[PDB]
Ligand binder design. Structure first.
Ligand SMILES: *[C@@H]1O[C@H](CO)[C@@H](O[C@@H]2O[C@H](CO)[C@@H](O[C@@H]3O[C@H](CO[C@H]4O[C@H](CO)[C@@H](O)[C@H](O)[C@@H]4O)[C@@H](O)[C@H](O[C@H]4O[C@H](CO[C@@H]5O[C@H](CO)[C@@H](O)[C@H](O)[C@@H]5O)[C@@H](O)[C@H](O)[C@@H]4O)[C@@H]3O)[C@H](O)[C@H]2NC(C)=O)[C@H](O)[C@H]1NC(C)=O
Ligand SMILES: *[C@@H]1O[C@H](CO)[C@@H](O)[C@H](O)[C@H]1NC(C)=O
Ligand SMILES: *[C@@H]1O[C@H](CO)[C@@H](O)[C@H](O)[C@H]1NC(C)=O
Ligand SMILES: [Zn+2]
Length: 595
């Protein structure tokens, strides 16, 4: 009987929540686009206001006997409304948390270092100045300089703020009756065996990672010499072409299986053909529409920031996509550069935008991903296609390419330097934070606990000796910005399930046809692949994620089968190559974090 009035209650509340969240998002956008004390105050004050309203909402749900209802849909919506998160904190505690959070994100965004060759020039930012050096320099001491300068300023500088953040995050979780923030995050996956599932999948892929690790270390020894890289120790991370060693594709030119054969790097051809950020976004838009998916609305073009501002202002340059919870008001903020990697990043961010557009008709509480990993996967599925020789030849970015057996191994290896390498990295980001949230590590051991995990899982280490005098975790954007990271591990697994199925649907993959390998599938122009996306993305969070996966390809289980299938030709070649070259596998425990 009560369910009739409850349905009307939800309809109104959802629309109210969308409108109130719109206001919060606008202030958060203004701050990220233009970091000032006034914008910080505005963002945080509006968030405090919404938090207060959320408290009233959660209190009001107790007036409805929602757990007694017949409708699974009504119950699911009511359950979503009971989950306050940080808004469960007392007014003062919430205000303090907001203040600490903006302190950490603004610190990260404002980091500037001095030029290695010119101690007078001290306006080098991570994006683009420091990352330019990290990705391109092969001077190991230059690399170590920039690593140390960045981590000292982006990491160590916010230890006290990070400590208070952990305290209030924990207090918030417990007010929602989760054990810690780890459980609060994991609740988004609606599966009480989710951690164990990921341990199992990770364990299956781990041997391949160790083969890649071993081979890369071998190749780095030939380049830098044994004084810089040892055979038996963890790889010094500053040599891996990335500030966090999360992906190694930037060093592919020195570690590629067949150096005399083609290695795909289209950055130069993009510049030669006069690519701009605008063109890159237009091309991303073209890819989605070619699949019979939704075109970018005018608000996107009018309101997005697709180049780093040329005035003196501070901003968050870490790429992001934004939903404003109205109709068609969606935006990206990216400090775009004309590179191959950046072309993939454009497609990644546009994947978020497409998800927003696909579910914008859903009630507010359902206007989010089936789970956080789904949201991160969408654009990467297209990026996998964009990265293929097949696609890059179509758009004239890859010229005179001969796809023989050796070129194929080079391309598979290049992909693995991004996709397999990332897996242990992503797992450690949340394994670390979970252990702090759960109170499993004493504050006296917080820094070496981070590096111990990086060692154990990724077999990498800092370029210089660190200690508990340093605090390196917040040097990663997501750690300073309090963004859950497990979403990316989930993404990198499930995106291959989505890719394999989309490719099969597009007639682009057949396991028994040598002419249709998975690693050269291009889903561009495929309405059938697009249909599967529409079927899944339009659901938003209206159903538990296995139902969303089922809508795409009929499966209900997160599985490492597809990613293993993609890389199987590489696994076979690499295992043999490592044996042929007597390549040492595994690593001794690092000496780079002193207790
Ligand atoms: C996280 O877990 C917390 C517990 O660990 C939990 O906190 C509990 O929430 C309960 C509300 O669900 C609350 O229960 C109420 O307790 C009142 C008295 O408690 C006082 O004394 C306690 C000592 O004994 C103190 O420790 C407390 O601090 C309090 O000072 C009761 O008066 C109250 O009762 C009324 O409400 C119930 C409603 O229950 C339903 O009512 C409908 C009728 O519409 C029934 O049809 C239905 O079957 C059901 O019974 C009525 O039944 C009753 O007639 C009264 O009107 C109520 O029991 C509890 O006090 C509180 N703390 C503790 C320590 O237990 C948090 O809520 C959890 N947080 C989240 C976010 O989930
Ligand atoms: C940044 O914010 C300030 C006030 O905080 C505002 O006056 C200014 O217009 C903004 N700058 C830009 C470039 O938008
Ligand atoms: C394009 O999508 C519409 C609905 O969104 C669908 O009806 C149509 O079949 C699609 N086009 C093709 C060629 O499949
Ligand atoms: Zn993303």
């Amino acid at each position: 009987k009560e369910e009739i009035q409850a349905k009307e209650y939800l309809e109104n509340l959802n629309k109210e929540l969308a409108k109130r969240t719109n206001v919060e998002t606008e202030a958060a956008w203004a701050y990220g686009s233009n970091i000032t004390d006034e914008n910080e105050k505005k963002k945080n004050e509006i968030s405090a206001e919404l938090a207060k309203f959320m408290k009233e909402v959660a209190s009001d749900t107790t007036k409805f006997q929602w757990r007694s209802y017949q409708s699974e849909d009504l119950k699911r919506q009511f359950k979503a409304l009971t989950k306050l998160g940080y808004a469960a904190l007392p007014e003062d505690d919430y205000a303090e948390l907001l203040d600490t959070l903006s302190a950490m994100e603004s610190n990260f965004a404002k980091v500037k270092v001095c030029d290695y060759k010119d101690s007078t020039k001290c306006d080098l930012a991570l994006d683009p100045e420091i990352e330019e050096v990290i990705s391109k320099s092969r001077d190991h001491e230059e690399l170590a300089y920039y690593w140390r300068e960045f981590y000292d300023k982006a990491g160590t500088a916010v230890r006290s703020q990070f400590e208070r953040y952990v305290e209030l995050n924990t207090k918030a979780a417990k007010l929602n009756n989760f054990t810690s923030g780890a459980e609060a995050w994991l609740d988004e996956y609606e599966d009480d065996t989710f951690e164990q599932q990921l341990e199992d999948i990770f364990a299956d892929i781990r041997p391949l990672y160790q083969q890649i690790h071993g081979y890369v270390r071998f190749r780095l020894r030939k380049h830098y010499g044994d004084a810089v890289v040892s055979e038996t120790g963890p790889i010094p991370m500053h040599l891996l072409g990335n500030m966090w060693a999360q992906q190694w594709s930037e060093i592919a030119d020195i570690v590629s299986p067949f150096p005399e054969k083609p290695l795909v790097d289209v950055s130069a051809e993009m510049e030669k053909q006069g690519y701009t950020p605008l063109k890159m976004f237009q091309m991303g838009d073209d890819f989605f529409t070619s699949m019979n998916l939704t075109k970018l609305p005018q608000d996107f073009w009018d309101k997005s920031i697709i180049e780093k501002p040329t005035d003196g202002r501070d901003l968050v340059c870490h790429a992001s996509a934004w939903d404003f919870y109205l109709t068609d008001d969606v935006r990206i903020k990216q400090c775009t550069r004309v590179t191959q990697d950046q072309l993939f990043t454009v497609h990644h961010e546009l994947g978020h935008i497409q998800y927003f557009l696909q579910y914008q008709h859903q009630p507010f509480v359902y206007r989010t991903g089936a789970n956080p990993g789904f949201h991160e996967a969408v654009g990467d599925v297209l990026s996998l296609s964009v990265s293929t020789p097949k696609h890059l030849e179509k758009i004239g970015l890859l010229k005179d390419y001969v796809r023989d057996d050796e070129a194929r191994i080079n391309q598979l290896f290049l992909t693995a330097l991004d996709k397999i390498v990332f897996l242990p990295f992503a797992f450690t980001m949340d394994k670390y934070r979970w252990s702090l949230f759960r109170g499993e590590v004493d504050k006296a051991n917080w820094n070496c606990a981070f590096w111990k995990l990086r060692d154990e899982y990724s077999g990498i280490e800092p370029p210089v000796v660190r200690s508990e005098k340093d605090f390196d975790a917040p040097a990663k954007y997501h750690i300073s910005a309090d963004v859950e990271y497990l979403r990316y591990l989930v993404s990198f697994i499930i995106q291959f399930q989505f890719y394999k199925s989309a490719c099969i649907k597009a007639g682009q993959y057949d396991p028994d046809n040598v002419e249709l390998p998975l690693d050269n599938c291009d889903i561009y122009g495929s309405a059938a692949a697009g249909a599967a996306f529409h079927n899944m993305l339009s659901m938003g969070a209206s159903k538990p994620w296995p139902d969303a996966l089922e809508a795409f390809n009929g499966e209900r289980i997160m599985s490492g089968k597809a990613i293993a299938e993609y890389f199987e030709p590489l696994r076979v070649w690499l295992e043999a190559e490592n044996i042929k070259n007597n390549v040492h596998i595994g690593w001794t425990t690092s000496n780079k974090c002193v207790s």
